[PDB]
Structure formats: C-alpha cells, structure tokens
Amino acid sequence: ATVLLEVPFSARGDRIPDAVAELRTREPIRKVRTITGAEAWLVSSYALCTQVLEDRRFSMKETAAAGAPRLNALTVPPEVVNNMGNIADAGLRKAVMKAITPKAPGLEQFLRDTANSLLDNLITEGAPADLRNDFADPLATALHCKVLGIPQEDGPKLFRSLSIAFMSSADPIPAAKINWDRDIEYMAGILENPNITTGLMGELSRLRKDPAYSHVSDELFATIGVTFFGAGVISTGSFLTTALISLIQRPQLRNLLHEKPELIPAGVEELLRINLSFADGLPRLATADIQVGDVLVRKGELVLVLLEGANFDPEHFPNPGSIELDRPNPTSHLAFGRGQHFCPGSALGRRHAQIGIEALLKKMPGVDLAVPIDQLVWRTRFQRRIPERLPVLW
C-alpha cells in the first residue's frame, strides 16, 4: 500500500518532472496531500487551470479562513491574503499600478545602469561569479527600492526577510512575524519621512494626508510597502535567476539573443512560459460546489492551480518544452496568473528580466555554468524554486 500523492513533486527548477505530463493526461484534476497533511485538488491542464482562475467562487481570500485545509502556514496576517482586494477597496488600485509601471521616466535607464555596474564588479573580481546573490537578487532589490522611493541602502536588510517570508512551511514561523512587524514599522516610518516624496511610498505618503483617503488606515499604507517589496523582489529575482539557467543551457538561443537583441522580449516571454519558479500550485478555496473536469469540488475544499501544468500543456502550447519565438499565442501562458488576481507587477517583471538578460549578454557573451548543473542546490520548502548559488564563468 502507498500513501496519497504528495505535493510538491520536486524543488528542482531546471527540469519539469515527468509526472506532470502523466497527471495531465490521465487525471488533470486529482487529489493530493499538502505539507500540512491537508488534502487538496491539484489541477494540471491549461483548460482546467484557466477555469479555476477565472471563477471567483474559487476564492483566494477564503484560503486564510480558520480551519480550512491549508497548502502551507500563513506567513502574513490573514487579512493580507486579500491584500490586492483591500487595496482596491481603499480606492488605491490605480495609484499603485501607476507607481509600479516600468515606463516611469528614467527607470529603465536606472535598471540598465544598475545591471551593468553589477556585472562590471563581477568581471573585475573574476570568475567564478554567483549570478543569484551577486546579480539577479541585487538587481531586483535595487529596482524595488527605486520603484518604492526608498533608500537603496535599506534594500539589503528588507531583502533578507524574504528567505523566511516566502517559506512554504507546515507550521507557523516565529521569525516571519519578527521580520514582518519590523518591516511594517520601517514602512510606517517611511510614510512619516519628509525625504520620501517619490515612487510608490512617496505617492502613498501624499494620499495618506489627502482628505479623499482619510478613511484608509496607516496599517494598509505600510502593508502596501512591505508586500509590494516582498512579492516583487522575490518573484523578479527568482524568475530572472532561473531564466538565466534556462538561457545558459541553450547556447544557441543565448547566441541568437546576443546577435539579435530585438528578440529578447519574445525570448523572455518564452522563458516566462517555461519558468518553474513557483514551487506550489496557486491556492484557492471553493465557496460553492463546482464541477471541474470529472470532479465535483465541494464547498470548503482546497484547489491548487499548477502553473507548469498549464504552461507545458501540449494541447495549448505544441512542443511545450521547446522555446519557440514565433508562437501564435505567446502571452497566453499563466506565469502571471489569470483573472481577478492577475499579477499587477507583470510589466515590471518582464522589463526587469529583459534588461537583466540584455545587460548580461552584452557584458558576458561567453557566460556558462562553472559547475555541473546537478551541483546546483535547490531551496526546499519555499514558495519559489531557486538555486542557493548560481556559479558561472565567462
């Protein structure tokens, strides 16, 4: 006898398990056990993943309810699971979105300058270099300090909360609350700091004193800073890191993009499609009985939307494992989700990766792994799949 299939399948972000395609073909919605011991429905086909994400009766907010089956333990206050809903209800969605656009004046130039400086420092120190800790993550951290309007020198300490904040744990994490409370206190101080007049926090600081927003709590304003820093930095840094691995292992694509950088956006879009950076399915709690494929999901049950299930589905993306730059449906992947909770940072995340890759290909055209790929150490029990170090030479 065997136990119920357990999720997640593998923390490795450099290859998709063969089990995904078998599940998708045989049982594209099927019962699994999460790290907490709860049962859940794992959805792995494009059609069913999109169905769940487009039906608000599969609720993100309700995953935080006491007594619900859990994918993992909360690392934020339960109300923050509904963060974007709270932002929208406060009338702040448009202002937040405008602050985090990659098109802000001078932003793209700042990111290129930062990428080029990071790379120059690695070249000066000499191979091997660690492209995660000394390139992708610092680039993400610098980008988000600039977007938020906060001092660059405050970035590293905020970043160091993230190895705990984005854990995927069976049990509550005491360090997560320590860091959360401290980071909230930091953002609350930023809102009171007269030097902070630009970026997202500069705009929230002004809206906070605007009578049209007098209802909104200081709690929400500080929470926006902590959450957009954390989600943005973890996702952009982790995506760029694993995209760099995908690129390094494809020297002909690396060369094609180096020779024709105008194809970088189409390349990044395919790297997004094939990306394994999300370590768990996206969770939703059913608020009604809802038929999904062959399964009547029952009110109160947990559903997990496996992004690589959808994104490697051959019925939607023929030859799904291949990077094809001329697909008819190129942004139709689920790397940024779909529906009510579609990523508000999608444009910033695309541009971060495009600029990072453009800079790396110009400065390090001969970039290659400096260790055999199996030697990468994949972080476990975390909400992203990332190598602890990414050693390269050039």
Ligand code: HEM
């Ligand atoms: C390559 C980079 C990124 C990727 C792959 C990514 C991926 C995702 C995905 C898949 C979701 C949907 C979550 C769900 O439906 O449960 C999401 C939502 C979200 N993302 Fe990102 N994201 C990226 C960058 C960013 C950035 C740069 C920011 C902010 C600065 C950000 C902030 C958020 C927030 C706040 C949500 C919740 C939206 C809501 O609940 O309506 N993300 N992201």
Ligand SMILES: O=C1N[C@@H](Cc2ccc(O)cc2)C(=O)N[C@H]1Cc1ccc(O)cc1
């Ligand atoms: O739970 C949330 N928490 C924050 C994201 C977040 C999670 C942890 C943390 O320490 C900071 C931010 C949110 O904005 N909405 C929700 C949903 C979410 C989760 C992860 C993620 O990457 C994006 C969204």
Ligand SMILES: [C-]#N
């Ligand atoms: C987005 N995290």
